[PDB]
Amino acid sequence: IRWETKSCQTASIATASASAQARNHVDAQVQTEAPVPVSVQPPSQY
Amino acid sequence: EVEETLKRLQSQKGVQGIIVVNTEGIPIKSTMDNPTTTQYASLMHSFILKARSTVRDIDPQNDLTFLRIRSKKNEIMVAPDKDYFLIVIQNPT
């Protein structure tokens, strides 16, 4: 005959943002040098 | 001795210059102007390497014996050797 009223509640939760990324690239530039440290005719005496 | 023989060759009516290429395309003696001295020495060094390889490729038991190049302007002859070759240029006219 005794009806008791009760109130229930569950705990809340917490989320968080995040990200993923594959490997990254970057540019590059090269110029080949053309040095010619060469004389005309060295008179050798080997 | 050899200096006189080179002059002797130079005196020949055909010969227009002599270059003694020693250090892998860098000459040590020349009877020509500086631009030509280096021009011929360098270019012919590259070529003779090709010519000697060509002989080894066409037959694996032979080396170069001689090469001749002819052109409208002039003609160039080279012979191979153990250490280094020699360039002679003539006027075919």
SS3 A38: coil
- Experimental technique used? cryo-EM
Declared resolution, Å: 3.9
> Which domain CATH number covers B76?
3.30.450.30
Taking the C-alpha atoms of residue B39 and residue B24, their distance in angstroms, rounded to an integer, is 13
Separation in Å, CA A39 to CA A43, B35, B85: 11, 11, 19
Question: Do residues B40 and B87 lie in contact, with contact meaning Cβ atoms separated by under 8 Å?
Answer: yes
Q: What does B65-91 look like in DSSP terms, one character per residue?
A: --EEEE-SS-EEEEE--SS--EEEEE-
Whose tokens are 């970057």? That residue is A26
Residues of chain B positioned with their CB less than 8 A from the CB of A38: 26, 38
SS3 B29: strand
B47, amino acid identity: F
CB contact under 8 A, B23 and A40: no
Give me the number of domains chain B comprises.
Answer: 1
Quote the domain boundaries for residue B23: 1-93
SS3 A33: coil
SS3 B43: helix
Element (H, E) at A30: none
Question: Nearest Cβ partner of B22 from A39, A40, A44?
Answer: A44
**Structure tokens that stand for A12 in this block:** 């809340």
* Residue from B34, B45, B32 nearest B74 by CA: B32
CB contact under 8 A, A40 and B29: no
Cβ count near B76 (within 10 Å) = 21
Q: How far is CA B52 from the centre of its chain?
A: 14
